[PDB]
Amino acid sequence: PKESILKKLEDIKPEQAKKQTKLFRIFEPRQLPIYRANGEKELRNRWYWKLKKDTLPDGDYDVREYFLNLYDQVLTEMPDYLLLKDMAVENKNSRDAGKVVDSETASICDAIFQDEETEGAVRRFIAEMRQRVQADRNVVNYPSILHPIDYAFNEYFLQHQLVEPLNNDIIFNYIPERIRNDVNYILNMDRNLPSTARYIRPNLLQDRLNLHDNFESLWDTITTSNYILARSVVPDLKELVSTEAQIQKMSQDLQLEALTIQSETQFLTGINSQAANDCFKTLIAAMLSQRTMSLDFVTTNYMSLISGMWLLTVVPNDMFIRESLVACQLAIVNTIIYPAFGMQRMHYRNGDPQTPFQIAEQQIQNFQVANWLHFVNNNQFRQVVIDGVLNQVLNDNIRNGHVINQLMEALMQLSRQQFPTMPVDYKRSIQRGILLLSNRLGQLVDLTRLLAYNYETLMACVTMNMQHVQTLTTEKLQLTSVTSLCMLIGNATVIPSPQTLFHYYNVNVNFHSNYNERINDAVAIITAANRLNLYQKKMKAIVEDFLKRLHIFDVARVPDDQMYRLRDRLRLLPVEVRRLDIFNLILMNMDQIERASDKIAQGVIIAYRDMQLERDEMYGYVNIARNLDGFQQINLEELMRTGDYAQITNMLLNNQPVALVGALPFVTDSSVISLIAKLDATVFAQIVKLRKVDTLKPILYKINSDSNDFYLVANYDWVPTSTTKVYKQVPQQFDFRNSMHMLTSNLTFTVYSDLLAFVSADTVEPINAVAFDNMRIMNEL
Amino acid sequence: NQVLNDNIRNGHVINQLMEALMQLSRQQFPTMPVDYKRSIQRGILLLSNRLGQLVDLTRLLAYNYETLMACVTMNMQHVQTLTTEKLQLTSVTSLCMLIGNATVIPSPQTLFHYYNVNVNFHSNYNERINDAVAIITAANRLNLYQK
Amino acid sequence: AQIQKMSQDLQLEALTIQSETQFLTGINSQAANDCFKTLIAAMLSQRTM
Amino acid sequence: MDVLYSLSKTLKDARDKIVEGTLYSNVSDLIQQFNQMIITMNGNEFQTGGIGNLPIRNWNFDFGLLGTTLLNLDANYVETARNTIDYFVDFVDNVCMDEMVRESQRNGIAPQSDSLRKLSGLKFKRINFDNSS
């Protein structure tokens, strides 16, 4: 309760400064003996590429999901910016110091630089391989070895760095183009930014989610929030006629007595040393958050009504609920304006729907009275766009802002109907109250000014493009307080503290940034989620996290519904270049990763026909085919899903040349023997007994009579006759020279969070402030 | 198998639902006190949003009935029973906005068991029928004018 | 969860004199199962309600 | 086409019902209709003319709305309006004339000008009214 949504709000710091150290790679080169055709180890040994972590699954599906997590890890580690002075390392060799990039880089060199390799050209290169700085442009040249796929990564990380410059001018510019402009306030800074500055652009695009169309439930929660936020600002008022004094002259001016009541119920309204401040705050926030309030009055508290007219003249009515403006107006129309304006006859009969206030317009005649009606009735909000960047602000009719000829007119109309009558007395109590508005009018003129400004000020600070809808939790406001605020003010002038204002900006800011950001985080995922065919990662998942990261919301305490509809809208959104640009990268090569690396394969072919084996250098000559040219196929993923249509069962039974595809467990064997016995024709049996298969551990034959104690056969003369080889590309080799890449980045940066702070915001003397009319706000003494 | 069916439309083509909703999406207007349309339409929307899911419901039944049904020997003409079976809109309403990506069906073993029963039963009915008839007819050409 | 967002949406107590005769909705974790079953059998069985 | 029509009874029932004096109520149903238009327009560009001795003029739209605020129209209200109508007048003229010259056999009936072919567009239909001419 109350200060329970504020501590959750003030306590929001999405401004994390993401950065990195380790150059993100995936494959470290490794050893392994060389097998020259004929199957002998020729020594020296060559260098190939395998992956750090062969995690890869069992089943195409589990595979795809796996990668997915990579995406999430990539984003959480997503390097916001980058710098290399912090990446230094040393080269054991070279024309000198060497200072290169990332431990791994180092290791490798020293390593190859010992195990007698291709000789010269390598040692040589490693040598005159250094760094150098082009100081002038603040540029940096650091050498580094990676792998086509690695350069790929880290590269874009450099060509992207979301860190724009930072000059005095930009600081000045992020201070709303309507406040620096506002006179009454003054800026001022204590330092001069270096050419070395930078800043993170907290992006704040609009409600890419039209969260007001049908979702009411949540808007209400927002408004609420934005509202409390507001009160936390709305300047606490200053010095106003001591409670007692006023209320005492109050009893006087009216003339009271003994069991002779008339106006006596108009002062359970005093308490304003509380009410005025509440009524004041409450009113603004309402506007800002653009929340809708209710109305608690009496029908015997006429005064309380009069002041209503004050209110009404102001807030465009649409700002209050329907069932409330209805009551109010008719209450006025029926017990306030007819019953002393010899207009009764029909105490006004009403039946709901249409506009019970309005109708009073085309009703009786009198000009003063008549203008009020049109001005109040058809008075709305002015829908205004841009405000020094898409603010999408709702403003109050220029007219009203201090050029309050409305108040003066609201009074003149009151001064003129206090003429005719009907029930003899009654008028006494009624008009007496009316006059208390008149005298005070000199001051009432003020109140208007106040709000006028304040709302009109605070405003700018909102980046949360507020709109105009019906709330639902409806904040409550009594005519009690209203009335107090009214006759109880003047001579005073109050205004938004500097520090206060910023704080306001800052918050909405963050918040925005978070919304926008998570949005991107969200989208990115879902889209990836589709071009993955994960018809099994039920999305009730993403939405949840999303909302959560936006505190305030009782996640568990909100249905599965709205949630889905939420996806439906997200799905139709683009991705932030950053996000997107990376996924394209992951996919594009995806294949290459998978296929390489052990612990898996791809698929197996069963040609009931003897056949040769490739002689690749890595392994001796074994069971492989990077092409599977011909034969039919059968997705396993679509198998253990389809429930196997004995299609496979039949083909296996009848022995027909065929193949399989997907995630698979390889199994290495040696002792030639196994081969001649044609062992690999086994395994396949299983299946028949078990519709589903994973129990399928396919066969491979790493064979080089060098390491295979059973060489006896390489002897005679020969050629490897197998039945059924394996789909699995082969780990590219390692051409160091070209396997390296070069890097650029910057030197001695300087990141800054928050900003603003750099200003001793001071204020003029209250007694002479100004509004959008260049006039002294508060001049009546 | 006289097993009164129903719209492929209903089946999974579902749309009726989509139309049941679209028709709802344009009922938001005046006439009486405010505490009315407010409360009313707000409820309606809860059907709408959920509509994405309400769809699923149709599918569900569509299948289930359309499935179970199969294993019924006992023909089934439509008749006006003499007894009702109370159904509290209470539950109805729940089921409605209260179902998510759930998806259940008839366990194999379950289905058979169903067939089996109707089967037996049938067989019994039919059989006793014969047992019955046989007797009565004999009963007449035996002049056993009694039972 | 649902019934709570329900009150947010529903605007429960708003003047009307006959409250809490709309929320006997409960025991739904069950009601749905009953309503569901009940509905099918009705059909199959060739019952009327 | 029907579009075109409105654009006029709009102005006539306008340049006629809108003058120094009248009480709002005789035009509430009118003002509205009017504004609606302005909106749909603003932003779009038009090509009028380009044949014979016919001036080729371009037209941009960026105009305000109306003050439903006042009661009995004050002179000042009119002038700030007439000035906005006189662009539509001098416009429509250049519009009618442009499609009042082109002809075609096959599809002679339908609209021809780069001005009108864009009017039959869907995003405009939000304008029709009082077709008693």
Side-chain angles (χ1 to χ4, degrees), chain A residues 216-217 221 472 556-562, chain C residues 1-9 11 14:
Chain A
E216 303 176 303
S217 341
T221 303
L472 209 290
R557 306 300 266 191
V558 173
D560 293 316
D561 48 34
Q562 307 290 44
Chain C
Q2 186 75 70
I3 316 186
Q4 217 217 189
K5 102 96 71 177
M6 204 66 63
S7 177
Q8 271 185 57
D9 256 69
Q11 198 65 301

mmCIF file with all atom_site columns, all heavy atoms in Angstrom, chain A residues 216-217 221 472 556-562, chain C residues 1-9 11 14:
data_model
loop_
_atom_site.group_PDB
_atom_site.id
_atom_site.type_symbol
_atom_site.label_atom_id
_atom_site.label_alt_id
_atom_site.label_comp_id
_atom_site.label_asym_id
_atom_site.label_entity_id
_atom_site.label_seq_id
_atom_site.pdbx_PDB_ins_code
_atom_site.Cartn_x
_atom_site.Cartn_y
_atom_site.Cartn_z
_atom_site.occupancy
_atom_site.B_iso_or_equiv
_atom_site.pdbx_formal_charge
_atom_site.auth_seq_id
_atom_site.auth_comp_id
_atom_site.auth_asym_id
_atom_site.auth_atom_id
_atom_site.pdbx_PDB_model_num
ATOM 1   N N   . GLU A 1 216 ? -7.236  -2.730  -20.855 1.00 0.00 ? 216 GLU A N   1
ATOM 2   C CA  . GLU A 1 216 ? -7.622  -1.887  -19.722 1.00 0.00 ? 216 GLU A CA  1
ATOM 3   C C   . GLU A 1 216 ? -6.974  -2.289  -18.403 1.00 0.00 ? 216 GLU A C   1
ATOM 4   O O   . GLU A 1 216 ? -6.282  -1.493  -17.772 1.00 0.00 ? 216 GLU A O   1
ATOM 5   C CB  . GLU A 1 216 ? -9.132  -1.914  -19.572 1.00 0.00 ? 216 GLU A CB  1
ATOM 6   C CG  . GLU A 1 216 ? -9.848  -1.469  -20.813 1.00 0.00 ? 216 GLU A CG  1
ATOM 7   C CD  . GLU A 1 216 ? -11.329 -1.608  -20.670 1.00 0.00 ? 216 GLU A CD  1
ATOM 8   O OE1 . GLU A 1 216 ? -11.778 -2.735  -20.389 1.00 0.00 ? 216 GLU A OE1 1
ATOM 9   O OE2 . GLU A 1 216 ? -12.037 -0.595  -20.834 1.00 0.00 ? 216 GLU A OE2 1
ATOM 10  N N   . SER A 1 217 ? -7.217  -3.530  -17.998 1.00 0.00 ? 217 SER A N   1
ATOM 11  C CA  . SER A 1 217 ? -6.663  -4.107  -16.774 1.00 0.00 ? 217 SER A CA  1
ATOM 12  C C   . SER A 1 217 ? -5.286  -3.553  -16.421 1.00 0.00 ? 217 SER A C   1
ATOM 13  O O   . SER A 1 217 ? -5.024  -3.122  -15.300 1.00 0.00 ? 217 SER A O   1
ATOM 14  C CB  . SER A 1 217 ? -6.541  -5.622  -16.957 1.00 0.00 ? 217 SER A CB  1
ATOM 15  O OG  . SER A 1 217 ? -7.370  -6.068  -18.021 1.00 0.00 ? 217 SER A OG  1
ATOM 16  N N   . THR A 1 221 ? -3.335  -0.231  -13.953 1.00 0.00 ? 221 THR A N   1
ATOM 17  C CA  . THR A 1 221 ? -2.150  -0.418  -13.118 1.00 0.00 ? 221 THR A CA  1
ATOM 18  C C   . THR A 1 221 ? -1.042  0.600   -13.422 1.00 0.00 ? 221 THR A C   1
ATOM 19  O O   . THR A 1 221 ? -0.286  1.008   -12.536 1.00 0.00 ? 221 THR A O   1
ATOM 20  C CB  . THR A 1 221 ? -1.603  -1.844  -13.278 1.00 0.00 ? 221 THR A CB  1
ATOM 21  O OG1 . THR A 1 221 ? -2.631  -2.797  -12.958 1.00 0.00 ? 221 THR A OG1 1
ATOM 22  C CG2 . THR A 1 221 ? -0.424  -2.053  -12.349 1.00 0.00 ? 221 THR A CG2 1
ATOM 23  N N   . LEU A 1 472 ? -10.222 2.599   -14.079 1.00 0.00 ? 472 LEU A N   1
ATOM 24  C CA  . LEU A 1 472 ? -11.028 1.516   -13.557 1.00 0.00 ? 472 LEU A CA  1
ATOM 25  C C   . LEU A 1 472 ? -10.924 1.430   -12.041 1.00 0.00 ? 472 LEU A C   1
ATOM 26  O O   . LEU A 1 472 ? -11.895 1.071   -11.386 1.00 0.00 ? 472 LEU A O   1
ATOM 27  C CB  . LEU A 1 472 ? -10.629 0.188   -14.206 1.00 0.00 ? 472 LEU A CB  1
ATOM 28  C CG  . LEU A 1 472 ? -11.791 -0.792  -14.286 1.00 0.00 ? 472 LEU A CG  1
ATOM 29  C CD1 . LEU A 1 472 ? -12.161 -1.286  -12.905 1.00 0.00 ? 472 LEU A CD1 1
ATOM 30  C CD2 . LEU A 1 472 ? -12.972 -0.094  -14.920 1.00 0.00 ? 472 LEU A CD2 1
ATOM 31  N N   . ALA A 1 556 ? 2.024   -13.799 -11.313 1.00 0.00 ? 556 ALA A N   1
ATOM 32  C CA  . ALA A 1 556 ? 1.175   -14.930 -10.978 1.00 0.00 ? 556 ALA A CA  1
ATOM 33  C C   . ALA A 1 556 ? -0.276  -14.475 -10.943 1.00 0.00 ? 556 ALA A C   1
ATOM 34  O O   . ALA A 1 556 ? -1.166  -15.169 -11.429 1.00 0.00 ? 556 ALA A O   1
ATOM 35  C CB  . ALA A 1 556 ? 1.575   -15.502 -9.623  1.00 0.00 ? 556 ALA A CB  1
ATOM 36  N N   . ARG A 1 557 ? -0.501  -13.289 -10.386 1.00 0.00 ? 557 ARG A N   1
ATOM 37  C CA  . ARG A 1 557 ? -1.846  -12.749 -10.264 1.00 0.00 ? 557 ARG A CA  1
ATOM 38  C C   . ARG A 1 557 ? -2.406  -12.089 -11.523 1.00 0.00 ? 557 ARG A C   1
ATOM 39  O O   . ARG A 1 557 ? -3.027  -11.025 -11.457 1.00 0.00 ? 557 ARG A O   1
ATOM 40  C CB  . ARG A 1 557 ? -1.921  -11.780 -9.074  1.00 0.00 ? 557 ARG A CB  1
ATOM 41  C CG  . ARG A 1 557 ? -1.444  -12.382 -7.738  1.00 0.00 ? 557 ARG A CG  1
ATOM 42  C CD  . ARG A 1 557 ? -2.246  -13.616 -7.270  1.00 0.00 ? 557 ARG A CD  1
ATOM 43  N NE  . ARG A 1 557 ? -3.346  -13.288 -6.353  1.00 0.00 ? 557 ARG A NE  1
ATOM 44  C CZ  . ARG A 1 557 ? -4.039  -14.186 -5.653  1.00 0.00 ? 557 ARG A CZ  1
ATOM 45  N NH1 . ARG A 1 557 ? -3.754  -15.480 -5.760  1.00 0.00 ? 557 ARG A NH1 1
ATOM 46  N NH2 . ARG A 1 557 ? -5.019  -13.793 -4.843  1.00 0.00 ? 557 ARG A NH2 1
ATOM 47  N N   . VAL A 1 558 ? -2.153  -12.720 -12.667 1.00 0.00 ? 558 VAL A N   1
ATOM 48  C CA  . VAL A 1 558 ? -2.684  -12.286 -13.958 1.00 0.00 ? 558 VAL A CA  1
ATOM 49  C C   . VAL A 1 558 ? -2.688  -13.507 -14.867 1.00 0.00 ? 558 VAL A C   1
ATOM 50  O O   . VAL A 1 558 ? -1.657  -14.138 -15.103 1.00 0.00 ? 558 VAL A O   1
ATOM 51  C CB  . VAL A 1 558 ? -1.896  -11.141 -14.619 1.00 0.00 ? 558 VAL A CB  1
ATOM 52  C CG1 . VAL A 1 558 ? -2.444  -10.895 -16.028 1.00 0.00 ? 558 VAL A CG1 1
ATOM 53  C CG2 . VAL A 1 558 ? -2.066  -9.861  -13.813 1.00 0.00 ? 558 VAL A CG2 1
ATOM 54  N N   . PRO A 1 559 ? -3.878  -13.851 -15.378 1.00 0.00 ? 559 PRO A N   1
ATOM 55  C CA  . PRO A 1 559 ? -4.319  -14.934 -16.260 1.00 0.00 ? 559 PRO A CA  1
ATOM 56  C C   . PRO A 1 559 ? -3.417  -15.244 -17.430 1.00 0.00 ? 559 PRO A C   1
ATOM 57  O O   . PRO A 1 559 ? -2.527  -14.472 -17.765 1.00 0.00 ? 559 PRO A O   1
ATOM 58  C CB  . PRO A 1 559 ? -5.678  -14.455 -16.743 1.00 0.00 ? 559 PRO A CB  1
ATOM 59  C CG  . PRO A 1 559 ? -6.160  -13.659 -15.618 1.00 0.00 ? 559 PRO A CG  1
ATOM 60  C CD  . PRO A 1 559 ? -4.952  -12.853 -15.259 1.00 0.00 ? 559 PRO A CD  1
ATOM 61  N N   . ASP A 1 560 ? -3.687  -16.386 -18.053 1.00 0.00 ? 560 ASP A N   1
ATOM 62  C CA  . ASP A 1 560 ? -2.938  -16.817 -19.215 1.00 0.00 ? 560 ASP A CA  1
ATOM 63  C C   . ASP A 1 560 ? -3.452  -16.025 -20.424 1.00 0.00 ? 560 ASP A C   1
ATOM 64  O O   . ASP A 1 560 ? -2.697  -15.763 -21.356 1.00 0.00 ? 560 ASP A O   1
ATOM 65  C CB  . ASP A 1 560 ? -3.109  -18.335 -19.456 1.00 0.00 ? 560 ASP A CB  1
ATOM 66  C CG  . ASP A 1 560 ? -2.478  -19.206 -18.351 1.00 0.00 ? 560 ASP A CG  1
ATOM 67  O OD1 . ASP A 1 560 ? -1.341  -18.934 -17.910 1.00 0.00 ? 560 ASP A OD1 1
ATOM 68  O OD2 . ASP A 1 560 ? -3.116  -20.192 -17.934 1.00 0.00 ? 560 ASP A OD2 1
ATOM 69  N N   . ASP A 1 561 ? -4.724  -15.626 -20.395 1.00 0.00 ? 561 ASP A N   1
ATOM 70  C CA  . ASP A 1 561 ? -5.319  -14.881 -21.509 1.00 0.00 ? 561 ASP A CA  1
ATOM 71  C C   . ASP A 1 561 ? -4.461  -13.726 -21.981 1.00 0.00 ? 561 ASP A C   1
ATOM 72  O O   . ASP A 1 561 ? -3.430  -13.950 -22.599 1.00 0.00 ? 561 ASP A O   1
ATOM 73  C CB  . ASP A 1 561 ? -6.705  -14.350 -21.147 1.00 0.00 ? 561 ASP A CB  1
ATOM 74  C CG  . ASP A 1 561 ? -6.742  -13.665 -19.807 1.00 0.00 ? 561 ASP A CG  1
ATOM 75  O OD1 . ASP A 1 561 ? -5.736  -13.024 -19.429 1.00 0.00 ? 561 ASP A OD1 1
ATOM 76  O OD2 . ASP A 1 561 ? -7.796  -13.760 -19.142 1.00 0.00 ? 561 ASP A OD2 1
ATOM 77  N N   . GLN A 1 562 ? -4.929  -12.500 -21.733 1.00 0.00 ? 562 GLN A N   1
ATOM 78  C CA  . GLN A 1 562 ? -4.202  -11.284 -22.078 1.00 0.00 ? 562 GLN A CA  1
ATOM 79  C C   . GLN A 1 562 ? -2.792  -11.661 -22.535 1.00 0.00 ? 562 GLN A C   1
ATOM 80  O O   . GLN A 1 562 ? -2.338  -11.229 -23.596 1.00 0.00 ? 562 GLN A O   1
ATOM 81  C CB  . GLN A 1 562 ? -4.149  -10.354 -20.848 1.00 0.00 ? 562 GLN A CB  1
ATOM 82  C CG  . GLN A 1 562 ? -5.518  -10.054 -20.206 1.00 0.00 ? 562 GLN A CG  1
ATOM 83  C CD  . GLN A 1 562 ? -6.418  -9.159  -21.060 1.00 0.00 ? 562 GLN A CD  1
ATOM 84  O OE1 . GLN A 1 562 ? -6.534  -9.350  -22.273 1.00 0.00 ? 562 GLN A OE1 1
ATOM 85  N NE2 . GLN A 1 562 ? -7.068  -8.185  -20.422 1.00 0.00 ? 562 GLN A NE2 1
ATOM 86  N N   . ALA C 2 1   ? -5.693  -16.708 -9.537  1.00 0.00 ? 1   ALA C N   1
ATOM 87  C CA  . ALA C 2 1   ? -5.190  -15.743 -10.506 1.00 0.00 ? 1   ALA C CA  1
ATOM 88  C C   . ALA C 2 1   ? -6.271  -15.130 -11.392 1.00 0.00 ? 1   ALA C C   1
ATOM 89  O O   . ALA C 2 1   ? -6.476  -13.920 -11.373 1.00 0.00 ? 1   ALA C O   1
ATOM 90  C CB  . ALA C 2 1   ? -4.116  -16.387 -11.370 1.00 0.00 ? 1   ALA C CB  1
ATOM 91  N N   . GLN C 2 2   ? -6.972  -15.963 -12.155 1.00 0.00 ? 2   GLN C N   1
ATOM 92  C CA  . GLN C 2 2   ? -7.995  -15.467 -13.071 1.00 0.00 ? 2   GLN C CA  1
ATOM 93  C C   . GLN C 2 2   ? -9.094  -14.654 -12.396 1.00 0.00 ? 2   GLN C C   1
ATOM 94  O O   . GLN C 2 2   ? -9.329  -13.496 -12.743 1.00 0.00 ? 2   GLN C O   1
ATOM 95  C CB  . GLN C 2 2   ? -8.610  -16.637 -13.850 1.00 0.00 ? 2   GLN C CB  1
ATOM 96  C CG  . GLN C 2 2   ? -9.604  -16.226 -14.942 1.00 0.00 ? 2   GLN C CG  1
ATOM 97  C CD  . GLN C 2 2   ? -8.943  -15.651 -16.189 1.00 0.00 ? 2   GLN C CD  1
ATOM 98  O OE1 . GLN C 2 2   ? -8.288  -16.365 -16.948 1.00 0.00 ? 2   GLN C OE1 1
ATOM 99  N NE2 . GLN C 2 2   ? -9.117  -14.353 -16.406 1.00 0.00 ? 2   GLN C NE2 1
ATOM 100 N N   . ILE C 2 3   ? -9.766  -15.242 -11.425 1.00 0.00 ? 3   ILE C N   1
ATOM 101 C CA  . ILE C 2 3   ? -10.831 -14.515 -10.768 1.00 0.00 ? 3   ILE C CA  1
ATOM 102 C C   . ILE C 2 3   ? -10.390 -13.167 -10.201 1.00 0.00 ? 3   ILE C C   1
ATOM 103 O O   . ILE C 2 3   ? -11.205 -12.245 -10.056 1.00 0.00 ? 3   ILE C O   1
ATOM 104 C CB  . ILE C 2 3   ? -11.441 -15.346 -9.659  1.00 0.00 ? 3   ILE C CB  1
ATOM 105 C CG1 . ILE C 2 3   ? -11.655 -16.776 -10.155 1.00 0.00 ? 3   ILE C CG1 1
ATOM 106 C CG2 . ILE C 2 3   ? -12.756 -14.731 -9.255  1.00 0.00 ? 3   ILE C CG2 1
ATOM 107 C CD1 . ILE C 2 3   ? -12.395 -17.669 -9.183  1.00 0.00 ? 3   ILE C CD1 1
ATOM 108 N N   . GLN C 2 4   ? -9.102  -13.042 -9.886  1.00 0.00 ? 4   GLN C N   1
ATOM 109 C CA  . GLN C 2 4   ? -8.605  -11.779 -9.347  1.00 0.00 ? 4   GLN C CA  1
ATOM 110 C C   . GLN C 2 4   ? -8.529  -10.709 -10.429 1.00 0.00 ? 4   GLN C C   1
ATOM 111 O O   . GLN C 2 4   ? -8.942  -9.578  -10.183 1.00 0.00 ? 4   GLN C O   1
ATOM 112 C CB  . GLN C 2 4   ? -7.228  -11.919 -8.684  1.00 0.00 ? 4   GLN C CB  1
ATOM 113 C CG  . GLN C 2 4   ? -7.099  -11.022 -7.443  1.00 0.00 ? 4   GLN C CG  1
ATOM 114 C CD  . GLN C 2 4   ? -5.718  -10.407 -7.243  1.00 0.00 ? 4   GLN C CD  1
ATOM 115 O OE1 . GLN C 2 4   ? -5.446  -9.813  -6.197  1.00 0.00 ? 4   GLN C OE1 1
ATOM 116 N NE2 . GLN C 2 4   ? -4.849  -10.530 -8.242  1.00 0.00 ? 4   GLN C NE2 1
ATOM 117 N N   . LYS C 2 5   ? -7.994  -11.050 -11.607 1.00 0.00 ? 5   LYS C N   1
ATOM 118 C CA  . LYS C 2 5   ? -7.911  -10.085 -12.715 1.00 0.00 ? 5   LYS C CA  1
ATOM 119 C C   . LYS C 2 5   ? -9.364  -9.806  -13.095 1.00 0.00 ? 5   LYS C C   1
ATOM 120 O O   . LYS C 2 5   ? -9.696  -8.761  -13.654 1.00 0.00 ? 5   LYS C O   1
ATOM 121 C CB  . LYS C 2 5   ? -7.139  -10.665 -13.931 1.00 0.00 ? 5   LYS C CB  1
ATOM 122 C CG  . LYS C 2 5   ? -8.006  -11.163 -15.113 1.00 0.00 ? 5   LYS C CG  1
ATOM 123 C CD  . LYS C 2 5   ? -8.192  -10.122 -16.235 1.00 0.00 ? 5   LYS C CD  1
ATOM 124 C CE  . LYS C 2 5   ? -6.916  -9.888  -17.045 1.00 0.00 ? 5   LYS C CE  1
ATOM 125 N NZ  . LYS C 2 5   ? -7.164  -8.937  -18.153 1.00 0.00 ? 5   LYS C NZ  1
ATOM 126 N N   . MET C 2 6   ? -10.223 -10.765 -12.755 1.00 0.00 ? 6   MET C N   1
ATOM 127 C CA  . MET C 2 6   ? -11.658 -10.711 -13.009 1.00 0.00 ? 6   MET C CA  1
ATOM 128 C C   . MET C 2 6   ? -12.319 -9.536  -12.300 1.00 0.00 ? 6   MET C C   1
ATOM 129 O O   . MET C 2 6   ? -13.092 -8.792  -12.892 1.00 0.00 ? 6   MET C O   1
ATOM 130 C CB  . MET C 2 6   ? -12.297 -11.995 -12.511 1.00 0.00 ? 6   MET C CB  1
ATOM 131 C CG  . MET C 2 6   ? -13.585 -12.326 -13.174 1.00 0.00 ? 6   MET C CG  1
ATOM 132 S SD  . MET C 2 6   ? -13.261 -12.674 -14.876 1.00 0.00 ? 6   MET C SD  1
ATOM 133 C CE  . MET C 2 6   ? -12.205 -14.130 -14.734 1.00 0.00 ? 6   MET C CE  1
ATOM 134 N N   . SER C 2 7   ? -12.031 -9.399  -11.013 1.00 0.00 ? 7   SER C N   1
ATOM 135 C CA  . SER C 2 7   ? -12.572 -8.308  -10.223 1.00 0.00 ? 7   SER C CA  1
ATOM 136 C C   . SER C 2 7   ? -12.069 -6.957  -10.749 1.00 0.00 ? 7   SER C C   1
ATOM 137 O O   . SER C 2 7   ? -12.822 -5.974  -10.767 1.00 0.00 ? 7   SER C O   1
ATOM 138 C CB  . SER C 2 7   ? -12.157 -8.490  -8.774  1.00 0.00 ? 7   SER C CB  1
ATOM 139 O OG  . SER C 2 7   ? -12.613 -7.408  -7.999  1.00 0.00 ? 7   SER C OG  1
ATOM 140 N N   . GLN C 2 8   ? -10.791 -6.921  -11.155 1.00 0.00 ? 8   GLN C N   1
ATOM 141 C CA  . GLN C 2 8   ? -10.130 -5.727  -11.733 1.00 0.00 ? 8   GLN C CA  1
ATOM 142 C C   . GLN C 2 8   ? -11.002 -5.279  -12.932 1.00 0.00 ? 8   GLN C C   1
ATOM 143 O O   . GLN C 2 8   ? -11.414 -4.111  -13.018 1.00 0.00 ? 8   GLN C O   1
ATOM 144 C CB  . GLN C 2 8   ? -8.666  -6.061  -12.227 1.00 0.00 ? 8   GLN C CB  1
ATOM 145 C CG  . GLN C 2 8   ? -7.448  -5.913  -11.218 1.00 0.00 ? 8   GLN C CG  1
ATOM 146 C CD  . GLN C 2 8   ? -6.037  -6.161  -11.856 1.00 0.00 ? 8   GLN C CD  1
ATOM 147 O OE1 . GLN C 2 8   ? -5.645  -5.509  -12.835 1.00 0.00 ? 8   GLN C OE1 1
ATOM 148 N NE2 . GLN C 2 8   ? -5.283  -7.097  -11.281 1.00 0.00 ? 8   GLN C NE2 1
ATOM 149 N N   . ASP C 2 9   ? -11.317 -6.247  -13.813 1.00 0.00 ? 9   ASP C N   1
ATOM 150 C CA  . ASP C 2 9   ? -12.136 -6.078  -15.038 1.00 0.00 ? 9   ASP C CA  1
ATOM 151 C C   . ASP C 2 9   ? -13.617 -5.879  -14.675 1.00 0.00 ? 9   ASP C C   1
ATOM 152 O O   . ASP C 2 9   ? -14.249 -4.891  -15.054 1.00 0.00 ? 9   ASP C O   1
ATOM 153 C CB  . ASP C 2 9   ? -12.033 -7.348  -15.953 1.00 0.00 ? 9   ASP C CB  1
ATOM 154 C CG  . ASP C 2 9   ? -11.108 -7.174  -17.210 1.00 0.00 ? 9   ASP C CG  1
ATOM 155 O OD1 . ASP C 2 9   ? -9.871  -7.068  -17.082 1.00 0.00 ? 9   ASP C OD1 1
ATOM 156 O OD2 . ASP C 2 9   ? -11.624 -7.180  -18.352 1.00 0.00 ? 9   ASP C OD2 1
ATOM 157 N N   . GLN C 2 11  ? -15.510 -4.961  -12.005 1.00 0.00 ? 11  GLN C N   1
ATOM 158 C CA  . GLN C 2 11  ? -16.136 -3.858  -11.297 1.00 0.00 ? 11  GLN C CA  1
ATOM 159 C C   . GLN C 2 11  ? -17.254 -4.474  -10.463 1.00 0.00 ? 11  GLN C C   1
ATOM 160 O O   . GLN C 2 11  ? -18.434 -4.156  -10.628 1.00 0.00 ? 11  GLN C O   1
ATOM 161 C CB  . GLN C 2 11  ? -16.722 -2.854  -12.290 1.00 0.00 ? 11  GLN C CB  1
ATOM 162 C CG  . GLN C 2 11  ? -17.007 -1.497  -11.691 1.00 0.00 ? 11  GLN C CG  1
ATOM 163 C CD  . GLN C 2 11  ? -15.741 -0.801  -11.241 1.00 0.00 ? 11  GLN C CD  1
ATOM 164 O OE1 . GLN C 2 11  ? -14.998 -1.317  -10.405 1.00 0.00 ? 11  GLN C OE1 1
ATOM 165 N NE2 . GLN C 2 11  ? -15.484 0.377   -11.798 1.00 0.00 ? 11  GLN C NE2 1
ATOM 166 N N   . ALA C 2 14  ? -20.695 -2.270  -7.628  1.00 0.00 ? 14  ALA C N   1
ATOM 167 C CA  . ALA C 2 14  ? -21.017 -0.973  -8.196  1.00 0.00 ? 14  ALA C CA  1
ATOM 168 C C   . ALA C 2 14  ? -22.521 -0.738  -8.131  1.00 0.00 ? 14  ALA C C   1
ATOM 169 O O   . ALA C 2 14  ? -23.223 -0.950  -9.115  1.00 0.00 ? 14  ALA C O   1
ATOM 170 C CB  . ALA C 2 14  ? -20.539 -0.908  -9.635  1.00 0.00 ? 14  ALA C CB  1
#
